[PDB]
């Protein structure tokens, strides 16, 4: 109905990256994904892959019964090393984007304050101008502390 | 006005197993088998689409 924020789901509409943002100032909607950390994630994610795939490959029935032994081991050996990095690929994701929260609670300060759900309503009105600076990591706050300090009044 | 931080979702029906959990649907993964026939490895994130 409305939109979202993390807590209750991811964003089908955001396609520019794994992680990223979207804003609604009075101009209009528009999903904008974070190239910043979507990249350095993938790079490591990519590095986890080959690091996994680097491990693939090192009396008649004796030979067979052995052949089937390491057909057995290796095949579960893999299964072992699949569930592992899979789970920890997935704590790596959720980690990053709570890190992509500290993102600007260490920047948006007290100008918006947690809606709870993972969104923010500004004591400001933040145009393209402004969300871009957030996205840039630019977001100053001598900005216009004052009005928000006033706007705070609410 | 508002700004939200979000993660990707899509219409992928692909699933993987983790140590802790089974058949989780995720947006993207690569299949390693160029034996027991179960070796999908995740690259994407947990697939949890909004709704509308």
């Amino acid at each position: 109905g409305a939109i979202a924020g993390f807590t209750e789901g991811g964003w089908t509409g955001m396609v520019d990256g794994w992680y990223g943002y979207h804003h609604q100032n009075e101009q209009g909607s528009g999903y904008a994904a974070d190239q910043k950390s979507t990249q350095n994630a993938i790079n490591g994610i990519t590095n986890k892959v080959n690091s996994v795939i680097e491990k693939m490959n090192t009396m008649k029935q004796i030979e067979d019964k052995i052949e089937e032994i390491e057909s057995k081991i290796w095949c579960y050996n893999a299964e072992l090393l699949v569930l592992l990095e899979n789970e920890r690929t997935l704590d790596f994701h959720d980690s990053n984007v709570k890190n992509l929260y500290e993102k600007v609670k260490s920047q948006l300060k007290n100008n918006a304050k947690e809606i709870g759900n993972g969104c923010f309503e500004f004591y400001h009105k933040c145009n393209d101008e402004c969300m871009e600076s957030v996205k840039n990591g630019t977001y100053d706050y001598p900005k216009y502390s004052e009005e928000s300090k006033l706007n705070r009044e609410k | 006005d508002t700004i939200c931080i979000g993660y990707h979702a899509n219409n992928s029906t692909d699933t993987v197993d983790t140590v802790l959990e089974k058949n989780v649907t995720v947006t993207h993964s690569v299949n390693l088998l160029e034996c027991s026939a179960k070796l999908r490895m995740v690259t994407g994130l947990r697939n949890k689409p909004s709704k509308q």
Partner: antibody
Amino acid sequence: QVQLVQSGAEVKKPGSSVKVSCKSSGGTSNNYAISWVRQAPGQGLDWMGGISPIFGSTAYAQKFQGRVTISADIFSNTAYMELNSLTSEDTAVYFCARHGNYYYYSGMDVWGQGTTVTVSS
Amino acid sequence: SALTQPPAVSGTPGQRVTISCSGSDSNIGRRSVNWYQQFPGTAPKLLIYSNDQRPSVVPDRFSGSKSGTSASLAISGLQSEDEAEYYCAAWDDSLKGAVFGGGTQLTVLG
């Protein structure tokens, strides 16, 4: 020292199909988006589509949609492009290109030698 | 094709000449443009990305600007080895695809 090495030139008669490979030699490009762009002889560049294997995106140009399949093998660091129902207009030189990042907005910074594909009865 | 380039340009050695690229709101208007170089029978090389940004190998004599719905590139101290065709490029959100200009053929005063 990464370089993209494409398969050699191929020629097939119309209505048949062709698969072109692009190997990332000297490293992997899996963490990058790779696009396929075609240049017909003495003509401009034309985006066909792209794939970002680890990211999980595969994209297609609208005109070539449904006729082209782009794929990657992460193990071999090789990306493949396959076109179907060839006609004379599909005769061209086909390049593989790597974007600056995981996505297609970024500039294409490593280019294959190019592969010539000729459609002739 | 979505992006607009003059078919051919000419310059004298040492002069500055500029080539323009006009798009619509769907491409350059909201996204960055990349432009490419082609010498005959060989693959392209990337000269500029992210509008005005320049790659490590490329000479400072190439430099860029883009405005509004159009972009243009100036080559200063034009030299003979520069003789080649260069293409504008951008992401298009309507197409959800990459687009290229028609291409511009540069000639150096013989």
